[PDB]
């Protein structure tokens, strides 16, 4: 292990104090009773992103329950080569500290080497009392497209209405808070901000190769790691990163 000494409210505070290496740092957001390890992605321009989700090789099963998604799972590595979910409580403590305006960057990688981005301005994750609801002001751009706005796959007219993510509470197979009369989290095997059900799903099943069929899932669920706006629902991503930085850094 190798956590760095400089600490802060987040990874940007950390970069502001001079840290120039990406790695494990301790941070203690405004309402954190205690500090905690995070992986900071620090680029040359002083930008310090607090990474809260990472997918890259299929080593961790993302079908976890409420308490597991609340507390975090997977492993943090100084080299940034492990998969993990920081925890809904920590993501909440950071994104809502001191009303600081945060931007969320979703970074995606192909099975063909191509990387795409999608930024969301004023990103926040509510408290447990409101089931860690996801809310943001507006899409700030990026080539991955805006999957969080919903998507008209074609299946129905209300598809868009039903696959948008803004305002959605979090759902795990054992804590269904979606807008579907079935259980989305349970049938797609993940923990996510489900509507009915999704156009962007980064905690889905890791499918080797990207392209996958309706058969690879007996009940025809499109449950891969998809971002409807960039790739087909039958294309599971190679790598995904969800990280946050104060809006002004954009």
């Amino acid at each position: 292990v190798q956590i760095h000494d400089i600490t802060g409210k987040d990874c940007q505070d950390i970069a502001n104090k001079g840290a120039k290496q990406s790695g494990l740092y301790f941070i203690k957001p405004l309402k954190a009773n205690q500090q905690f390890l995070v992986y900071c992605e620090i680029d040359g321009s002083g930008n310090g992103w607090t990474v809260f989700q990472k997918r890259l090789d299929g080593s961790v099963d993302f079908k976890k329950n409420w308490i597991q998604y609340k507390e975090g799972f997977g492993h943090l590595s100084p080299t940034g080569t492990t998969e993990f979910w920081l925890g809904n409580e920590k993501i909440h403590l950071i994104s809502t500290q001191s009303a600081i305006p945060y931007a969320l960057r979703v970074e995606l990688e192909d099975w063909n080497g191509r990387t795409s981005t999608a930024d969301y301005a004023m990103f926040k994750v509510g408290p447990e009392a409101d089931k860690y609801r996801l809310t943001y002001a507006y899409f700030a751009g990026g080539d991955a497209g805006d999957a969080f706005d919903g998507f008209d796959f074609g299946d129905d007219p209300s598809d868009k209405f039903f696959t948008s993510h803004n305002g959605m509470q979090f759902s795990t197979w054992d804590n269904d808070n979606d807008k579907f009369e079935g259980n989305c989290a349970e049938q797609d095997g993940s923990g996510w901000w489900m509507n009915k059900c999704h156009a962007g799903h980064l905690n889905g099943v890791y499918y080797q190769g990207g392209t996958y069929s309706k058969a690879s899932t007996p009940n025809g669920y499109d449950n891969g790691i998809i971002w409807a706006t960039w790739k087909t629902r039958w294309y599971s991503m190679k790598k995904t990163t969800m990280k946050i930085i104060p809006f002004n850094r954009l």
């Binding site: 796959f153 209300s158 598809d159 039903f162 696959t163 009915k196 059900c197 999704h198 409807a228």
Partner: peptide
């Protein structure tokens, strides 16, 4: 994706 969507649902019924």
């Amino acid at each position: 994706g969507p649902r019924p």
